[PDB]
Design a protein around this ligand. Structure first.
Ligand SMILES: CCc1sc2ncnc(O[C@H](Cc3ccccc3)C(=O)O)c2c1-c1ccc(O)c(Cl)c1C
Ligand SMILES: OC[C@H]1O[C@H](O[C@H]2[C@H](O)[C@@H](O)[C@@H](O)O[C@@H]2CO)[C@H](O)[C@@H](O)[C@@H]1O
Length: 515
């Protein structure tokens, strides 16, 4: 077991109030003798799943609720079991964001939404519409100033515009069959952003650091940022307001709402100290004030302390923008949707891809997991039982049908030609229950990993998976077919993601074996 016992390590993002969090760790250490280390590593949302998976990493991880469903799906988080007394101290909707398969997987800390931030000295009336920002930039450019600068490297900041005229991630429970990443509304919003860049009103290269510096030295009239950014603006002496985001096509910008949440590592031998630090030290008037004094949290989940901060108009603007937005879903494929949209916005902005090209590729990566499982689960199940699934694939399922048709035709030959080799490998792997199926996964990455990438090898993997599903059903282990399909899908899309999207995904597969 790698994680040290008798002490707490905390991971929190570098835009957050980590010095304030460390003051609450000092107060925990002063009362219990347990040293709390707070770190803010780069890409901790990428690195937590990698190190947690091997029993390593921090005791507590802080991030918006959107990444927590994937970590729970991978068994990287402890179940949070606060009593009714502690649960009543926080807003029920904040608890809704940290509930996954009916289990609390984290402690909610604060509701974050993007607002529009403007220089009252340059722009006494901020724009009501996105459409008027070009004329405003022209006007401010004559004065050696610019209208707007925000981070174009993170899809988070651009999403409100993309979602305004009907863009969305998963239709709402959440329908992961229904992805709205390349709909007319999404094209309209992202096209308007590329047009601002084309007409020199914004810069494709602008990241968080550049946008913050330009706003805080009064070079740009406007930025798009969250509560965490107010501290640095306070220091900079800029007379700023926090207001409702400008509308697009007469409709509000819908910011993706995040709930800063604290998760407990499953591998942690200090889960009792972590529960005690989070419930009785951090989630208190004194604890949330210590963190908020460093960098504002936004609208905190703690009712007592949220009553006080509600009077602040910048919080009111945050909640107004939050109402017009959507609570982010916490489902496992959020990570793949964010990765896909990040790439789409960066490519459309730089002109490497068109808005049509970029958003189509992001709609493929957003659907790739569910689309792959649908094909593999149906193939494995129909091979095991001898009867096809009657149910319809759905509205976007023309690809799944042709891909299953191609897999049937192409992959039945592979089962026949490799029968002897498959039987040899299935005998040598002693499969017999869900436990034995857990083993297999480890094998398949090792095998599917260090080899040349082609549709031929993808077919062999799925074909051997069907062969194992046939065996599973034969020994009354038919319930293990759905998890084996999940594991084959997991190996394939987690390791070949970038290749599968370059091949137009399953359309590429049908195209490749067409005759
Ligand atoms: C967990 C087992 C998997 S998963 C997977 N995914 C893609 N390809 C595989 O094997 C082929 C090579 C090959 C040559 C002749 C017969 C079968 C396959 C390859 O790597 O190209 C495999 C194998 C695998 C590897 C070695 C073997 O001897 C057997 Cl029987 C198998 C089933
Ligand atoms: O940009 C995609 C990104 O969006 C959100 O991350 C936000 C985070 O929620 C905020 O707390 C803030 O600090 O900035 C981040 C933007 O870089 C999602 O939470 C995150 O999962 C996703 O990758």
């Amino acid at each position: 077991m790698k994680i040290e016992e008798g002490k707490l390590v905390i991971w929190i993002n570098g835009d957050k109030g980590y010095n304030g969090l460390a003051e609450v760790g000092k107060k925990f250490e002063k009362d219990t003798g347990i040293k709390v280390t707070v770190e803010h590593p780069d890409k901790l949302e990428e690195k937590f799943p990698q190190v947690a998976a091997t029993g390593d990493g921090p005791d507590i991880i802080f991030w918006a609720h959107d990444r927590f469903g994937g970590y729970a799906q991978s068994g990287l988080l402890a179940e949070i079991t606060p009593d009714k007394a502690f649960q009543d101290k926080l807003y029920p909707f904040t608890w809704d964001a940290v509930r996954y398969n009916g289990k609390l997987i984290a402690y909610p800390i604060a509701v974050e939404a993007l607002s529009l931030i403007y220089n009252k000295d340059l722009l006494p009336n901020p724009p009501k519409t996105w459409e008027e920002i070009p004329a405003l930039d022209k006007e401010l450019k004559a004065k050696g100033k610019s209208a707007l600068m925000f981070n174009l490297q993170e899809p988070y900041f651009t999403w409100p515009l993309i979602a305004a005229d009907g863009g969305y991630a998963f239709k709402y429970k959440y329908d992961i069959k229904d992805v709205g990443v390349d709909n007319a509304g999404a094209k309209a919003g992202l096209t308007f952003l590329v047009d601002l860049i084309k007409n020199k009103h914004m810069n494709a290269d602008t990241d968080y650091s550049i946008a913050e510096a330009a706003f805080n030295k009064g070079e740009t009239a406007m930025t798009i940022n969250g509560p965490w950014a107010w501290s640095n603006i306070d220091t900079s002496a800029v007379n700023y307001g926090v207001t409702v985001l400008p509308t697009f096509k007469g409709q509000p910008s819908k910011p993706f709402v995040g709930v800063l949440s604290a998760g407990i590592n499953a591998a942690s031998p200090n889960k009792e100290l972590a529960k005690e630090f989070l419930e009785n030290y951090l989630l208190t008037d004194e604890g949330l004030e210590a963190v908020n004094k460093d960098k504002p949290l936004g609208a905190v989940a703690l009712k007592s302390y949220e009553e006080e901060l509600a009077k602040d108009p910048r919080i009111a603007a945050t909640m107004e923008n939050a109402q017009k937005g959507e609570i982010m879903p916490n489902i496992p494929q959020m990570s793949a949707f964010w990765y896909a949209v990040r790439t789409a916005v960066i490519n459309a902005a730089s002109g490497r891809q068109t808005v049509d090209e970029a958003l189509k590729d992001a709609q493929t990566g957003s659907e790739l997991y569910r689309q792959s499982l649908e094909i593999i689960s149906r193939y494995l199940r129909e091979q095991a039982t001898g009867a096809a699934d009657t149910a319809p694939m759905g509205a976007s399922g023309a690809t799944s049908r042709k891909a299953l048709e191609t897999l049937r035709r192409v992959g039945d030959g592979v089962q026949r030609n490799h029968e002897t080799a498959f039987q040899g490998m299935l005998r040598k792997l002693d499969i017999k229950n869900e436990d034995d199926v857990k083993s297999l996964s480890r094998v398949m990455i090792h095998v599917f990993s260090d080899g040349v990438t082609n549709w031929g090898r993808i077919v062999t993997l799925i074909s051997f998976g069907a062969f194992v599903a046939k065996h599973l059903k034969t020994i009354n282990q038919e319930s293990c077919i759905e998890p084996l399909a999940e594991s084959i899908t997991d190996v394939l899309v987690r390791t070949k993601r970038d290749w599968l999207v370059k091949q137009r995904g399953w359309d590429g597969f049908v195209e490749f074996f067409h005759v």
